[PDB]
Amino acid sequence: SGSLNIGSLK
Amino acid sequence: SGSLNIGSLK
Amino acid sequence: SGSLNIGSLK
Amino acid sequence: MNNLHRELAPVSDAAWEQIEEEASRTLKRFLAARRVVDVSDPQGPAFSAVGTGHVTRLEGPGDSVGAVKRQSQPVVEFRVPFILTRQAIDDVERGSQDSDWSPLKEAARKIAGAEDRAVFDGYAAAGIGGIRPQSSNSPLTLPVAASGYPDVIARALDQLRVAGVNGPYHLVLGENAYTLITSGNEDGYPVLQHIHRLIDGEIVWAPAIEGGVLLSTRGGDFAMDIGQDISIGYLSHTATHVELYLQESFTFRTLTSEAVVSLLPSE
Amino acid sequence: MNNLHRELAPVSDAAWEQIEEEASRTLKRFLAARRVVDVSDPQGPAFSAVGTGHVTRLEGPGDSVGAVKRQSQPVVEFRVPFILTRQAIDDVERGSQDSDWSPLKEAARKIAGAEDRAVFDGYAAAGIGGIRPQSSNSPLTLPVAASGYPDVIARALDQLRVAGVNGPYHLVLGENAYTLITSGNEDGYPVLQHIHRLIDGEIVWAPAIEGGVLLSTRGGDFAMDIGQDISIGYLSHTATHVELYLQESFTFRTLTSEAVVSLLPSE
Amino acid sequence: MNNLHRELAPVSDAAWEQIEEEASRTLKRFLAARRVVDVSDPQGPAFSAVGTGHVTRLEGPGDSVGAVKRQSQPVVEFRVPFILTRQAIDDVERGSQDSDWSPLKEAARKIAGAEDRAVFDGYAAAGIGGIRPQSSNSPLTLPVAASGYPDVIARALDQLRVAGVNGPYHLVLGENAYTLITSGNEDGYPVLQHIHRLIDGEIVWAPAIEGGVLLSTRGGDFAMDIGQDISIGYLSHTATHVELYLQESFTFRTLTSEAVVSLLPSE
């Protein structure tokens, strides 16, 4: 909780 | 595989 | 058995 | 409640939503290394080290007993604080659509730059070698003019091919190189079409680095282990300000040193 | 095939069974720390470090970015080789019941002693503090005569009680102390019955250590993380001999320093 | 057990998987002749010769009896040994992802180069004529500059058309010619688009050969009969090293000499 969930952009 | 599975003796 | 199965690359 | 004490911040739900949207947009615009690097799923707050598989010989405990210690790479945590004015936060509930989120954008730029520089150029304190300094291929200098770009890229590709490396080839360019290649030539040469004939994707824009990199994205060469993705946490507040921070937790390893060629900035 | 290349050894199945039975028996007789310490299930060959939860401040990457490195304890691997004569191995298939497994027993004793000394007295090279040197209570010297044992044990128990520590209390004694307490007194005093009135289990016999330890076994104070349990692997063979080894992989941490009292050997 | 005594090697299953993956990747990157040549399915270890259909007159056995001997082309076996350090092999089971497989890659490069040079330039000892020396068309010299490439290719195509040869036309270029054609021209001429207008596929990159070849891939002109595909076998091991080898078994025949034009390296 609180994360922006950017993760991988590939 | 190959272990003697001594583990915990308590 | 043991081959890499490269075969044809066409 | 977790370590990001978000419920303790005097910030409404609408303000939180706007802040998160702005942070996600700015980070996605600025994050470049995540587009060409194997990024794992977040492994949680307890994730502390990654085992490299290698061992180091120790001085033995005693009578004919040999000892080896397993080697690992530690995880690093990056935190960047920023301050909001509490007028932008309160105006959101009143229907504001142009609240000042500039400190958040500057913090996002700072943390993205730190992450990118660690992944590409290395961070010695955290034990991160970096993609470029850990390359076994010979670096190539970028040309002054854009017309020279097809010649360098091709040669770089040749190195990869000579090294036995396969898979799609991706180009990452810094700000000056990217704007030089995209601004066209005054002789009518179509360098962009030729480059896109040689490379296997869109050119990646990297504001944090200088020069460039040509690398394979076959998978398994550059591993980014994410413990905690970039998240917003709360520190403190005054009557007219709120302290927040952007935090991430990760480690990076270069596994194949022959799968990347580093392009030096033009002189 | 795994790293224990057992199928490459010129050893029959019956010989393997007899060797494993002998090793298990001898190790169970010699292993003392596993009786009073939280032992985890084996975590596999890839298990390389345990995160301690603490961080160390780093020199920052750059503009207003702070960095902390996660701390961890590495895993240590212990290996002890031994040589069998290939006559004992071949005699097993012929119906032998008294094949010479003495080198295996000596290797088992060596590895059990190394493990016990690392857990109790510490192993500095592997980063293992040890239970006794990492005790915050004041150590007590053991008496010359067995009659003095009820007085010391009681005082040791008091320390635990004063420290707020609960749970069953177990006593681990080295060879000299154990044989002194079990050999009786010449005055007819029943020190053994009084000791078993004070302690909450059987006295543990520890051939590897000197002195003793009184410790709580409530759980959560002494964690032994097992990567690989003790196993037999193969190295090489000649026309008349076979090289094997005993190997284990573990790390140990003392979490509660007030939950143990160290008894010094008598002077 | 077959002639590749793989089970006798002190190599774990995970190490075997990583080794095979690396070998397959490197060989697929380096193998060029297999992309423009009819490759049969592997015919097994017993496959020893290929009948050409022709006969040779013999001195007769006796009274008015004539004898002819059937002609055939023998199969050749290529083997390249390499040595691994047994630390890279053992580290795999411990979770390593950057084990040193450089000797394997060098062996793969060597065997691929030998195969390619036999198929293209010929191997006299094995009775392999080679595609280029067995061409009935007149060879063409490659130009110094890339702008001259559309002129040569077209003329080469004309030869094929004049010879009555049909089917898709494929271009195979050596390292220097490939990097010259792909590096662009400084006059803005689009030679690559024109070449891809003339040829019927991607340009094939051949690191083993010099110059190039333009050939038809209609089928039935260049037959590569595979007895054993490239495979990894075991030879011997020391306490710190393992001997492996890469092995293949094949024969090659050029059936149509007018279906290929050989391009000589530029002077």
Numbering used by the authors:
A (entry chain B), B (entry chain B), C (entry chain B): 337 to 346
D (entry chain A), E (entry chain A), F (entry chain A): 1 to 267
From the paper:
Encapsulins are self-assembling protein nanocompartments capable of selectively encapsulating dedicated cargo proteins, including enzymes involved in iron storage, sulfur metabolism, and stress resistance. Encapsulation is mediated by specific cargo protein motifs known as targeting peptides (TPs), though the structural basis for encapsulation of the largest encapsulin cargo class, dye-decolorizing peroxidases (DyPs), is currently unknown. In this study, we report the structural and functional analysis of a DyP encapsulin system from a Gram-negative pathogen – Klebsiella pneumoniae (Kp). DyPs are ubiquitous, often homohexameric, heme-containing enzymes, named for their ability to oxidize and degrade a wide range of synthetic dyes – with concomitant reduction of hydrogen peroxide to water.
To overcome this challenge, we utilize a heterologous cargo-loading strategy based on a small and monomeric cargo protein (SUMO), fused to the native KpDyP TP, which allowed us to achieve sufficient TP occupancy for cryo-EM analysis of the TP binding site. In particular, the C-terminal 22 residues of KpDyP – containing the putative TP – were fused to the C-terminus of the 11 kDa monomeric small ubiquitin-like modifier (SUMO) protein via an 11-residue flexible glycine-serine linker. After heterologous expression and purification, single-particle cryo-EM analysis was carried out on SUMO-loaded KpEnc (SUMO-TP_Enc). The consensus icosahedral (I) refinement yielded a resolution of 2.4 Å and the resulting cryo-EM density showed substantially improved signal for the KpDyP TP. As such, a ten-residue TP could be confidently modeled (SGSLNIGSLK) highlighting the details of the TP-shell interaction. In particular, TP-shell binding is mediated by a combination of hydrophobic, ionic, and H-bonding interactions. The three hydrophobic residues Leu340, Ile342, and Leu345 of the KpDyP TP interact with a geometrically complementary hydrophobic pocket located on the interior surface of the encapsulin shell protein. Additionally, Lys346 forms a salt bridge with an aspartate side chain carboxyl (Asp38) which is part of the shell protein P-domain. Multiple hydrogen bonds also contribute to TP binding, including interactions between the TP backbone (Leu345 and Gly343) and encapsulin shell residues Arg34 and Asp229. Finally, an intramolecular hydrogen bond between the two TP residues Asn341 and Ser339 appears to stabilize the observed TP conformation.
